[PDB]
Amino acid sequence: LVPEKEKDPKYWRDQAQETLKYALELQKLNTNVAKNVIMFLGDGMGVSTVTAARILKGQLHHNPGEETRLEMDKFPFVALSKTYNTNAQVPDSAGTATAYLCGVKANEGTVGVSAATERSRCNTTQGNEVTSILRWAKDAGKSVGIVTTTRVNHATPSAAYAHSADRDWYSDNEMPPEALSQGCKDIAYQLMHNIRDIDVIMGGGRKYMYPKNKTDVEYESDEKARGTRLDGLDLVDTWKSFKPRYKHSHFIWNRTELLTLDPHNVDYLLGLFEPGDMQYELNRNNVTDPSLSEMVVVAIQILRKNPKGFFLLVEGGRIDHGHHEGKAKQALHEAVEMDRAIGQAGSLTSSEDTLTVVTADHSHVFTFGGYTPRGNSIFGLAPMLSDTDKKPFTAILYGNGPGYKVVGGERENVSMVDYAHNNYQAQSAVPLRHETHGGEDVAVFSKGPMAHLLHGVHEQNYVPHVMAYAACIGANLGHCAPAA
Amino acid sequence: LVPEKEKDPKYWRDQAQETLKYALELQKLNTNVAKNVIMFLGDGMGVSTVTAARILKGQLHHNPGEETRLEMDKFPFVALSKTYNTNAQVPDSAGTATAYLCGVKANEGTVGVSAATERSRCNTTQGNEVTSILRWAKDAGKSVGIVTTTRVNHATPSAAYAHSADRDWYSDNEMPPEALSQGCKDIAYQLMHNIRDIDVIMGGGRKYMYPKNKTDVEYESDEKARGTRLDGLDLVDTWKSFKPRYKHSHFIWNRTELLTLDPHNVDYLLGLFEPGDMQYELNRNNVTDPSLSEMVVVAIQILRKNPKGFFLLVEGGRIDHGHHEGKAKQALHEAVEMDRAIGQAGSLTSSEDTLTVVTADHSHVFTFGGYTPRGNSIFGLAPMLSDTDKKPFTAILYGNGPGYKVVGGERENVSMVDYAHNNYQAQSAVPLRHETHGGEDVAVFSKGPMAHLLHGVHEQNYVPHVMAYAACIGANLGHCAPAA
Amino acid sequence: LVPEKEKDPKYWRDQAQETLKYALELQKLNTNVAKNVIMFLGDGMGVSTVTAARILKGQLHHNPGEETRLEMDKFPFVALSKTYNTNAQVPDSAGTATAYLCGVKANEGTVGVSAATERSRCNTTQGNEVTSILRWAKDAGKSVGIVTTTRVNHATPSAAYAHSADRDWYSDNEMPPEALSQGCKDIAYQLMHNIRDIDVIMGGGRKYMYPKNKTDVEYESDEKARGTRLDGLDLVDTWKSFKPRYKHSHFIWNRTELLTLDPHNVDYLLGLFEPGDMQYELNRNNVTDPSLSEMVVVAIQILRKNPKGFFLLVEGGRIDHGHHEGKAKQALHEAVEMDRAIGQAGSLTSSEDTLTVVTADHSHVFTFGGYTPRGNSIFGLAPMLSDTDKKPFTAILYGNGPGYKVVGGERENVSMVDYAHNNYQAQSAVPLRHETHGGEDVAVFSKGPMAHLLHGVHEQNYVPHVMAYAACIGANLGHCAPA
Amino acid sequence: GVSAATERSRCNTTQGNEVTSILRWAKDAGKSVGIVTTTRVNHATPSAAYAHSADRDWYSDNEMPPEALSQGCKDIAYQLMHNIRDIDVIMGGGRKYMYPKNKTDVEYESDEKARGTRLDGLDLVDTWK
């Protein structure tokens, strides 16, 4: 396409020199204290997904896109995060979360607990618990919030509150007899009982909260949507019970109630907007379900009221799922939506006292190549046909996953399919049920007080140690001590 | 494997708080002036490549691998660089090196010219040349060196001294008639003539220097190692004839003469170690050819004589050819070999005066992931088998290229083959003759003075401006005016 | 030009539909309490002036410019403000200030008093004083700050603390002895003595604080910089004196001191960076003198301490000087600089508890136009030459001012002149020493709590009344009324 | 600090029956707060300003029966530093309940009976700063 302004060297020079001046002003560091702390987590947002979703974002504005700036791009400080679990080389959603929430690396498949546990053997839990930064914030006075698009007892959000030996123990319904009978209690149970004054909780998981076979508020006619608690416990009610009566506690289940609440009025909030995982944003109901930006806006309004500050984890957690499904147009629109939410937060707070980290737990085997010309749709085709099998190919290609498609001994001629569809699954090399995670590092975008402390190549479990220090919470208290 | 020390949460807590202590000390920025600037370019060294190579270095020491620190991993300041070309969303090795060496972004396939130059069109070069940091540093009075493992007129180093409308014009042999008509000389010519006192040149490409059909000094029988020049010019000899009279000038071609040189006592070196590209470090002749770290060290020793400092450019540029061949084992080893060069360079210069920026031009469609357990070999296999055709797969997989191996509509059973061999090509999604570049972002690593200025998610063309500012060369001399 | 995307109707429809989608969501009105209040005041930044300024900001980035968004362009709520003074159809710098700061229109020439007072007559200042929103806000226990690129006692910042029957009475040197004997105080004396705890005061006007003939600290070889107080008073030392017992006061005078500051250690700041008016942004000493954005940042960094909130007045006051001189490139660069400063104010505060308001006191007779093509430089020429005298002309043109040039009965052919130059005076219709104000309306831009209350075409006095209601300060404070 | 649902020395009946004191209400509204007594500062009377316990006897953990500690409740001295962490003025007695078991006293260095008591090993004076 070649924009006309970009053929002028003065353009590229002027631009780089402006960039330089800013980097010269960034030498005055922010050594304030983090009153508030916010962490964004694109589940599965590796470095390649960041780029592809920057392109996507701008392309939704009829710009070439590669020139575009994400909201996460504007963060002054970036670093790289080594993401392997003690258990495995190519890590998982949960043990990574124990790293970047609890400050301790752990075995795959285990939340809230250290490496001294094995997965699914349950007596190995006690004495091997590590508490998260969300627990550190609450014990410090702050308000704590969790916002996600996955089940609020899924792998990423659990390690903010739970301590399980298996990520799969959503309720007692999916536990084995042994773990139950050995005393262990489900993630959905631990959401309500480990920290009982979690100010904001928003996401999915309505069906893990209600007594078995109880109908759903949204879908009566759906059986798989029905309750699963073998406890017979109404955990929505167990929740309302654990909050004082002279404080306003609201439980909502749809968008309309969400955009109806008065934030200066409510004290505790539980929004459970689907039985399990929430909608893809391409798939959402503008009526019944809210967006992630909507959840995050209201969440910060409630949590802003605490004068001690607050801590808010936000999981753009459905990015992982679009990739696992091999449906990249889903993964990428999911990531753009978590960027819209990042934008919102920066508008509702101030760089001067709020430390914001955007990062990923791990990455996927999502690539895009093919020498595509400037501005070529990210879901478009590489510019000419294969050197080998003489058929065209997509710019996006996966390393493994369900896109593998050899229609009769040869690979699909994607010219008369719709690669531009929402549920198109780009080809991969190894067919599988699901696409796997990637071992490559992920970036760490930091803004606000003490953000520069996230530098270089670090281990993933360094991430919450930085934040805890900046907000004078947790184990190290030096950034507030007069001894510093 | 799950190492024992790593089961104690004290272990990780102690490590992060170690890392936290280091991070606080970096609050004392290094505001010195860059006496010397050394830039390590790894042709095609994507984020995923760096991580995979970090593991391999550690696995060559029989450590688990994932917990290793490459030499480049020890740089304090990491950033993400946006790689796209004005022309091409997925860029090439030429127009990116215009950007990270001249600070201007260009069209794919051109070097040292603005985007107002159209590829292969010679009459569009005049008036659109843009000079390089290597030029800016000669003009400030420094020693300038180029040390690559590709040809010394390959697209990457050629952007440092040349201004050419097609990466492909190696000699005048490879130039169309009307391009010679119109007047613009080949690259090999420009290497000798544009900047006629380059202090160190070293790498491949010897055949491009000698006139057509002239037996190579090393490969006397080989017919493709003969010179290519219709010029008739002996450019090794022209290189000698430009240099000042009472200064000692040397031209080497085998590894032995390199180490016999006494650096304290040579002023102008030219080492041409192969008729074309130097061979992969795995096929390196201990006898006839030096390694990157051997070329680098001898180079630095000749350059630190100049009291005004030196700019060195080092390209570990067979990383790109590695991935392009699908031979992940080649490219990873190149990457590690370039890391060894980074350590050598570090122990021959001081941080207090030497800004060392390490980055890449672009990435590749190289991924790894298979849920491989901790310590797994990087070239090894994924633990359990494909859900869709029950065959095994390698943890390393490509998005395209020559690893696509269907053996009858079924995809090759790799339990049958040596998936750990050097020239083994991991499988790909789309069969192409050559694996393609990836359009995602690449890391920048920086240590030494002003290194904290390479900080965010920035355009690729930003890099040489930081370097030129740090060093008080080129356009913005502001780091050296009276302004402390 | 004609960018490639703008040829496609989907582009313009997608664009509108997202502009509309945002417009809907803005229906959930922000009714919070303005903890902090920030007012940005572009002196002379009329409506024509901010269209040209938005071109300029984007043209700096090598864009065509017209599609660029300023920072204030991003505020949700726009209004038109009727600027007329009470004895002047085309208003002045000071009497408007009485309106948009004190909520009361007044006569041209007078700060901080009502329309009862006649100019240069002190014996009508007696008992005709109106207080400003700075006073009202301080009176409710907020920190308050003034940050300007004119003198800190110029016409516009003097409406926040002074009640002076003549905007010329900068110090007592400039006052007729007839008024000194009626017993009035110069604005500079009034700064330090009326509201004695203003937390930040930043700008020009240093020479009015030191005693007469006193050699100046920055430009000492020069006597138009020397002290002017006949009082013999040292109001920098007088300023340090009225501060509470255990509080840190500074007084800084150069840019190095401004960024050395630790805003966790400075309760009262005073910063006087030039003897008189500060240097145009395009002329400024990178080293001795701070930009407007630099001053706004550490001003907010200090005032963020106070837990009750703060009020801050920011005046980009040198746009008026730029137009008055006919030098559009200075006036437009001053406007862009204040925009930068408006962007900074957005990242250091949050729109949930901060109402910020961007406006101008009045406009100028600055126009621009001549069927220029798209992307044409704002300081460039119309495409065709005058069909009458066959000579080029500049897109930017003035109603009056020093721009008028006739070289021997002949209007100046301008291809022969550097009309892009930082001091070029684009041609006018009536020559004058200084170009004049405009009597047209000026926009208001408001973001944050109760910002939607600045809504239509209102009188100019109505502005601080909305700011005061929303921050629960001053005379009407039913927005906090436990109901 | 507990309602009438709690039962004395039955720890697991604390959660959900805490009631907060006027001292807490006052700090929550921004007032400075102080507690000056001549008894120990974790004695019955002042403790109701900050603590919520099921037995007044639980001055430090050294006095707590283990199943109380097992069920997680913290001793009153602990709660004095942790519950409201900005009590402006705390004056009175109870120095021994603030330091780890057997640290001699700053004032009576040769008293058996005056050594620290904390099995937490904690220095609650530093905890407090």
Ligand SMILES: *[C@@H]1O[C@H](CO)[C@@H](O[C@@H]2O[C@H](CO)[C@@H](O)[C@H](O)[C@H]2NC(C)=O)[C@H](O)[C@H]1NC(C)=O
């Ligand atoms: C969102 O949830 C609210 C529940 O508060 C729904 O409103 C209720 O709808 C039922 C069905 O007619 C009424 O009997 C209730 O009186 C309503 N309550 C309130 C507070 O309005 C609402 O319909 C839901 N919206 C959607 C789209 O499902």
Ligand SMILES: *[C@@H]1O[C@H](CO)[C@@H](O[C@@H]2O[C@H](CO)[C@@H](O)[C@H](O)[C@H]2NC(C)=O)[C@H](O)[C@H]1NC(C)=O
């Ligand atoms: C891949 O598919 C395309 C289209 O399905 C094939 O190309 C078309 O062949 C028909 C045959 O008459 C033409 O009418 C079309 O114009 C062709 N082009 C397109 C874009 O439709 C193509 O040959 C197929 N190639 C392989 C290797 O399968």
Ligand SMILES: *[C@@H]1O[C@H](CO)[C@@H](O[C@@H]2O[C@H](CO)[C@@H](O)[C@H](O)[C@H]2NC(C)=O)[C@H](O)[C@H]1NC(C)=O
């Ligand atoms: C490395 O290069 C040197 C120089 O080209 C080689 O040495 C030459 O050997 C012949 C044999 O008679 C002599 O006549 C030349 O004069 C020698 N030159 C010099 C400079 O000594 C040497 O053989 C080469 N070694 C390898 C391993 O290739």
Ligand SMILES: *[C@@H]1O[C@H](CO)[C@@H](O[C@@H]2O[C@H](CO)[C@@H](O)[C@H](O)[C@H]2NC(C)=O)[C@H](O)[C@H]1NC(C)=O
């Ligand atoms: C993939 O190849 C492997 C090895 O070539 C097959 O596995 C072996 O097959 C032989 C057949 O005689 C058995 O005796 C071995 O016990 C098998 N296992 C191993 C570990 O060697 C395997 O069946 C092939 N799978 C497919 C789907 O083709």
Ligand SMILES: *[C@@H]1O[C@H](CO)[C@@H](O[C@@H]2O[C@H](CO)[C@@H](O)[C@H](O)[C@H]2NC(C)=O)[C@H](O)[C@H]1NC(C)=O
């Ligand atoms: C900015 O102001 C500071 C302080 O007003 C100046 O520092 C003075 O430096 C001289 C030496 O050059 C000392 O003798 C003085 O004692 C310092 N002043 C004070 C008040 O301590 C500084 O030189 C000024 N810088 C510029 C660029 O104008």
Ligand SMILES: *[C@@H]1O[C@H](CO)[C@@H](O[C@@H]2O[C@H](CO)[C@@H](O)[C@H](O)[C@H]2NC(C)=O)[C@H](O)[C@H]1NC(C)=O
């Ligand atoms: C306005 O000035 C321009 C020059 O700045 C005049 O144009 C030149 O006129 C001479 C002869 O009169 C020609 O030789 C040149 O080629 C013209 N062009 C330039 C760029 O110099 C123009 O005629 C003047 N017009 C009026 C009405 O005064």
Ligand SMILES: *[C@@H]1O[C@H](CO)[C@@H](O)[C@H](O)[C@H]1NC(C)=O
């Ligand atoms: C847990 O129970 C199992 C019974 O299968 C036993 O073998 C194991 O030793 C127990 N673990 C511990 C830590 O006691």
Ligand SMILES: *[C@@H]1O[C@H](CO)[C@@H](O)[C@H](O)[C@H]1NC(C)=O
């Ligand atoms: C949401 O509203 C838009 C209005 O433009 C409509 O086109 C869209 O179909 C609605 N949502 C979905 C999921 O379709």
Ligand SMILES: *[C@@H]1O[C@H](CO)[C@@H](O)[C@H](O)[C@H]1NC(C)=O
């Ligand atoms: C560049 O060369 C071509 C080759 O003949 C010529 O046709 C063309 O006109 C030249 N470019 C311009 C701008 O004239």
Ligand SMILES: *[C@@H]1O[C@H](CO)[C@@H](O)[C@H](O)[C@H]1NC(C)=O
């Ligand atoms: C290089 O030399 C080492 C020992 O010096 C030898 O063991 C190795 O096999 C050689 N490698 C090649 C590729 O020639």
Ligand SMILES: *[C@@H]1O[C@H](CO)[C@@H](O)[C@H](O)[C@H]1NC(C)=O
């Ligand atoms: C007060 O103002 C009047 C205006 O009519 C003037 O004549 C008179 O002299 C003033 N007062 C004094 C004491 O001069």
Ligand SMILES: *[C@@H]1O[C@H](CO)[C@@H](O)[C@H](O)[C@H]1NC(C)=O
């Ligand atoms: C201000 O600094 C810049 C450095 O980039 C320089 O180019 C410019 O000329 C300087 N101008 C003044 C007036 O100091």
Ligand SMILES: *[C@@H]1O[C@H](CO)[C@@H](O)[C@H](O)[C@H]1NC(C)=O
């Ligand atoms: C207290 O403990 C007893 C057994 O020690 C238990 O049965 C009872 O349920 C507990 N109380 C509560 C309120 O859970």
Ligand SMILES: [Ca+2]
């Ligand atoms: Ca719903």
Ligand SMILES: [Ca+2]
């Ligand atoms: Ca050789």
Ligand SMILES: [Ca+2]
């Ligand atoms: Ca000055």
